[PDB]
Task: structure prediction
Amino acid sequence: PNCYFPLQSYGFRPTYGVGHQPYRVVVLSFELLHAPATVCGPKKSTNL
Amino acid sequence: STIEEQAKTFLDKFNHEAEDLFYQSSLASWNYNTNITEENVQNMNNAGDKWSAFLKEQSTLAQMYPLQEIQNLTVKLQLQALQQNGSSVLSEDKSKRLNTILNTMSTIYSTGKVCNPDNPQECLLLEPGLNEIMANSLDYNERLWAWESWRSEVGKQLRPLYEEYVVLKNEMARANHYEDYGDYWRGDYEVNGVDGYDYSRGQLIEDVEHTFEEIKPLYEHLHAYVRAKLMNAYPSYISPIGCLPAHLLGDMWGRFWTNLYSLTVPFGQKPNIDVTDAMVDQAWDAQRIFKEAEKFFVSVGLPNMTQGFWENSMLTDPGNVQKAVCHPTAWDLGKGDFRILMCTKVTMDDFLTAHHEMGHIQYDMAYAAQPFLLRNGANEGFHEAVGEIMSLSAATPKHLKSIGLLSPDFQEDNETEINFLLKQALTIVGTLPFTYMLEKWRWMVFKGEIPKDQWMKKWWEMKREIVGVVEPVPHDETYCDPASLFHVSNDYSFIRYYTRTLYQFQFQEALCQAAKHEGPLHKCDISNSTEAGQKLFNMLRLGKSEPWTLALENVVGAKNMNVRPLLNYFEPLFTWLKDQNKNSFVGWSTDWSPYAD
Ligand SMILES: *[C@@H]1O[C@H](CO)[C@@H](O)[C@H](O)[C@H]1NC(C)=O
Ligand SMILES: *[C@@H]1O[C@H](CO)[C@@H](O)[C@H](O)[C@H]1NC(C)=O
Ligand SMILES: *[C@@H]1O[C@H](CO)[C@@H](O)[C@H](O)[C@H]1NC(C)=O
Ligand SMILES: *[C@@H]1O[C@H](CO)[C@@H](O)[C@H](O)[C@H]1NC(C)=O
Ligand SMILES: [Cl-]
Ligand SMILES: [Zn+2]
Result:
């Protein structure tokens, strides 16, 4: 009676409010630490 | 360790489960009411007993928490509202007897039929004919026949059923520590444990008696004027000092005097405000009406409606292929879903009704953040009052002129405003004595102050005393004429309308004072006033987690009902009516009756 299953459901339907709308979220995390950097953006130049 | 935290956890789980269950039930209701089929009815039954079983299970689970050991007021009110067990504490046999009585008498009211004495196979139901028979026809004999036939057909059947119902309700009240069922219904306005805001059960009776005493001069002046007009209309039926007949009041029971405006118009040559011509000329539709209401509501600062409401709600009659019941009703399905259902026509009355319905929506969305147990008004009387105040504000000719529905060349004068005040009084002033009378009679039969064998005699005696209505045909105790009304015949309270009449005009006075408007109150408008909007929201937000007196003070600064706004509103009509009534008798004589010659 005081012990419950700690999982709920996200009832989603296409007739819901914007505040309750199922937004899609992805978080991007970086690290500014002294280590060999393998990933960063490109750049290009002009002509010879 | 403590009990209040256990109750808090139980309420936390209850809110989460009940949200989904009530959403399912209300969505089923919305789909049934919009599309009338049989499988929709079946889904309604399934959801209905599912929700009722959840309610009874949760009550039988949470009854074991004693209310004496909780200090937080919100959870206290939650557990008090949940712990009311209703008919369950009574024996199961009597509970089934009570529900069978309710079903039988509801069916009697809904399917009651009366046949004319000349054609046995030609019979008329109350809804789609009896009302019209006496709300459109001016013949005395037809109205008398309809009234007598309806009462003789319903009251004779419903008398013993109502006696058993009242007895069962008295046992029900004594079961849960109330003296009478009238006390159970008065329990709506009770609050305890809040200093400076408490209210007792007899305080409501005392206050309503005082308010009626303060208001009765207006009713008696209007009664004298209407009696004089009916004298000019029907010269050989009523004494100029006697009471008005029951079947000459406009509707089934004399509840409203709206019908008699045509017969009692002071100046029938002045034009009446009707924007239906402007409705059809500008090719307005339902969507434009609701956009107009939306902009009127956004003008004071309230938010516009959600997209789901404009996407999924049915804003028009669904053709002829599918049938729907479209009485004006605002639905709170929960989970941030709001809906409206009403067959919209291009009329001014539908404009005001749409404004009322979206005022209902606004009130309902105001407390959407409150818990499941507390998502309701401070009491029952705030919803419809807030709905009606918006229609009252929109009915002002100034707003219609601003929104371009009336030409600016329209000349407002004393005569048109007097006619407007008189029709408003006929709609409003007429119903207050009848609601007070009916609810007081219900109180006094529930408390047992009246033996069975003189219910009707005392009913009619006090009616001819206060409400000034005398029966044209003498009746015995075999009748149950109170059960001829929808409210009496289906277990609803009726002081709600009097409380709403007080609340709506008190709110109008407060908001008009906040709106910095000069002149008569009927011309007052609240648009373009964000101060009025924020003042409205300051009471809109709470819901009922706090005492209704505090919510009332939040908008008006007063802790109790008062009658000053109504008399201040009708003072021009007061002086006009007292000027007219100088040559007519004021008051009514209880002895005279149409059947006594
Ligand atoms: C009402 O229900 C019937 C039965 O399924 C359906 O055919 C009809 O389209 C419905 N009406 C609507 C959705 O307006
Ligand atoms: C009552 O309970 C609510 C819900 O947890 C909480 O927010 C509020 O602070 C409590 N009030 C008191 C006075 O403990
Ligand atoms: C809703 O109201 C806001 C604020 O007044 C306004 O900016 C917005 O355009 C409105 N949306 C609609 C659809 O009317
Ligand atoms: C409300 O303000 C708007 C914006 O200036 C104006 O167009 C409208 O006429 C005003 N209405 C009233 C009733 O003051
Ligand atoms: Cl009646
Ligand atoms: Zn309403």
Remarks:
- The two ends of chain A are 79 Å apart (CA to CA).
- DSSP finds no helices and no strands in chain A.
